[PDB]
């Protein structure tokens, strides 16, 4: 019926957006670094993702024969499932949701919790022990920063009585929650940066460095699926950031000239600014050591998140400012 059509219309444009997102990351990083990104495969490099995908498809696969063939193959499948089903709930405007779950926030938190298993199984199923150690490190980092992310979600849930993203936005109608909670938004942005192993806290992508990663053993399509899952998670958490601290499909100042824009355009624009911030932070800053980032996650963001939860609860309970 219409549900498979909606699911396909969510999934395929998401893959196109991920491809153009890696292309945009290349272009923005190059323009930052006083150079030009992919410009020779199509006009302005618009066909570069297509060429890359076709090359990856046409590349002949190799079988590691690691005695864990099923677990080796299914881990990128698992993370791809997790990214897609996480994207299954995010709203885009008033009524553009597949599952209008009343517990949408906790659903996304649970899906983020499940995300470590793909990397853990990928590291274990690989023959090399370096990949296993890197997978363990990445899993632990995602664990700590997801604890921080959950505390930020609790702050937002204190601000808004409901638990579904659509009603969250409907409450965001007034002040966007970013004006009241800009430090909370900053902490959530850094936590989601460390959640997807992007920007600083980039352990798996430091392959030229001694940490190596969990994708060393993986073949063409395994690596491609892991990359697609990571970038889909990046877009997902940018959407989470804009739905939580920027009002989602809501204009600025509620002027009637701004209401001519559908609102899905507003959500897309905010997601684009968040992705630009992702690439900006990745290009502009060095990376943390594993111990440094773990101590920072467990000692800097967790106490601050707890303190902000307490402060928001105290502000809301004391005054009649409660929903």
């Amino acid at each position: 019926i219409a549900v498979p059509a909606e699911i396909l219309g969510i999934i395929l444009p998401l893959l196109l957006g991920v491809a153009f997102l890696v292309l945009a990351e290349r272009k923005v990083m190059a323009f930052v670094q006083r150079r030009k990104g992919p410009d020779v495969v199509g006009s302005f490099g618009l066909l570069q993702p297509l060429a890359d995908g076709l090359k990856l498809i046409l590349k002949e696969p190799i079988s590691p024969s690691s005695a864990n063939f099923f677990l080796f193959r299914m881990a990128p499948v698992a993370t791809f499932m997790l990214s897609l089903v996480a994207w299954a709930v995010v709203p885009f405007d008033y009524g553009m949701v597949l599952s209008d779950s009343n517990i949408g926030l906790l659903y996304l938190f649970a899906i983020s919790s499940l995300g470590v298993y793909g990397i853990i199984t990928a590291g274990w199923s690989s023959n090399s022990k370096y990949a296993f150690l890197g997978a363990l490190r990445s899993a632990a980092q995602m664990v700590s920063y997801e604890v921080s992310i959950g505390l930020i979600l609790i702050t937002v849930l204190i601000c808004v009585g409901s638990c579904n993203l659509s009603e969250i936005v409907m409450a965001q109608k007034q002040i966007w929650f970013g004006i009241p909670l800009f430090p909370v938004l900053v902490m959530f942005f850094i936590s989601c940066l460390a959640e997807t192993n992007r920007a600083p806290f980039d352990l798996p992508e430091a392959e030229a460095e001694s940490v190596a990663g969990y994708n060393v053993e993986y073949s063409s399509m395994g690596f491609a699926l892991f990359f697609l899952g990571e970038y889909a998670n990046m877009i997902l958490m940018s959407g989470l950031c804009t739905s939580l601290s920027l009002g989602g499909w809501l204009p600025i100042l509620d002027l009637p000239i701004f209401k001519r824009i559908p609102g899905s355009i507003w959500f897309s624009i905010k997601v684009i600014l968040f992705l630009f911030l992702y690439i900006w932070v990745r290009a502009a800053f060095p990376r943390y050591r594993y111990d440094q980032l773990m101590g920072l996650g467990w000692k800097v963001f967790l106490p601050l998140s707890l303190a902000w939860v307490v402060a928001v609860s105290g502000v809301s309970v004391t005054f009649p400012w409660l929903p």
Binding site: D39, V40, V41, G42, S43, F44, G45, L47
Partner: protein, 127 residues
Amino acid sequence: GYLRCLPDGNLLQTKIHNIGATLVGVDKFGNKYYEKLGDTQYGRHRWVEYAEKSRYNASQVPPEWHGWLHFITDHTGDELLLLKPKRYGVEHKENLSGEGEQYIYHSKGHALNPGQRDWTRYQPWES
């Protein structure tokens, strides 16, 4: 050649750069040499359009325009053509190097050479 811009993207950059340029010359192979001074950075004020949009090659620039294009000389290719030597000389040929065994260069001892020469430095008795 403007339809090649959509699947090329590099010819697109060249056409974007030929907005305010002045056509300083053209060679006998069709390559059109452009110069653009003013508010332009140093490294991108001279260039060429190879007039072969499908398979343009970096070795298609003749020696007469090679120096001017590479910023060795202020002399355009016309002056070097005027100064081209007589009584000897060959026409410019691209770096094929893979377009065919009959096109590539072969040593005198290579089996692919049309005439292969033996190398022993002695003449046998040859009854």
